Amino acid sequence: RLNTLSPAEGSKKAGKRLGRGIGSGLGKTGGRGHKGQKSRSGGGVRRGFEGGQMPLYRRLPKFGFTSRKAAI
Amino acid sequence: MYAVFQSGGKQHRVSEGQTVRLEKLDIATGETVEFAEVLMIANGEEVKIGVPFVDGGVIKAEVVAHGRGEKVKIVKFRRRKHYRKQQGHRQWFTDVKITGISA
Numbered sequence A: 001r002l003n004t005l006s007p008a009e010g011s012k013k014a015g016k017r018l019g020r021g022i023g024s025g026l027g028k029t030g031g032r033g034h035k036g037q038k039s040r041s042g043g044g045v046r047r048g049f050e051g052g053q054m055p056l057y058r059r060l061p062k063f064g065f066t067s068r069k070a071a072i
Numbered sequence B: 001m002y003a004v005f006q007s008g009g010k011q012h013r014v015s016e017g018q019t020v021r022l023e024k025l026d027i028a029t030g031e032t033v034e035f036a037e038v039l040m041i042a043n044g045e046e047v048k049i050g051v052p053f054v055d056g057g058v059i060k061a062e063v064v065a066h067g068r069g070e071k072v073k074i075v076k077f078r079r080r081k082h083y084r085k086q087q088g089h090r091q092w093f094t095d096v097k098i099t100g101i102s103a
Helices: none
Strands: B002-006 B011-015 B019-023 B032-035 B038-042 B059-065 B072-078 B083-089 B093-101
Touching: B011 B019
Parallel strands: none
Antiparallel strands: B002 B011, B002 B038, B019 B093, B032 B059, B059 B093, B072 B083
């Protein structure tokens, strides 16, 4: 019977493979569009980057303090 | 000695005792079929249709085969636009032999 067990429907998806033909859908850059920083290998912006504008976590003021008694 | 009749949206001119291929019909391969929609009957003397479909003309035909037509390959290709598509088609057909043509 070892060649009769099957998984539940919807348990597997087979993943996404990029750049494998036209009919496969996401080929020819595999869904990352045309030129640009995001299209490059290893490209992208770090967390909180807004394109040069002051990030939200920098526009706002830090407040409060940590209490050691709260951890005990 | 030939008649004109309308079967599958397209008219056919068939002589006595000849096989004609026409669109698929809901008839088994070993049963006779009737075509009372006779457009024109021709003989030594000529008879036309004052009203369409003559008056009493019928055609007796026997089904022979219910095969599929030759494969046709459909190719859609957009130049430079990263779009190609392939498809195949086999049209169903019915072979029928005309057994008798009335007056």
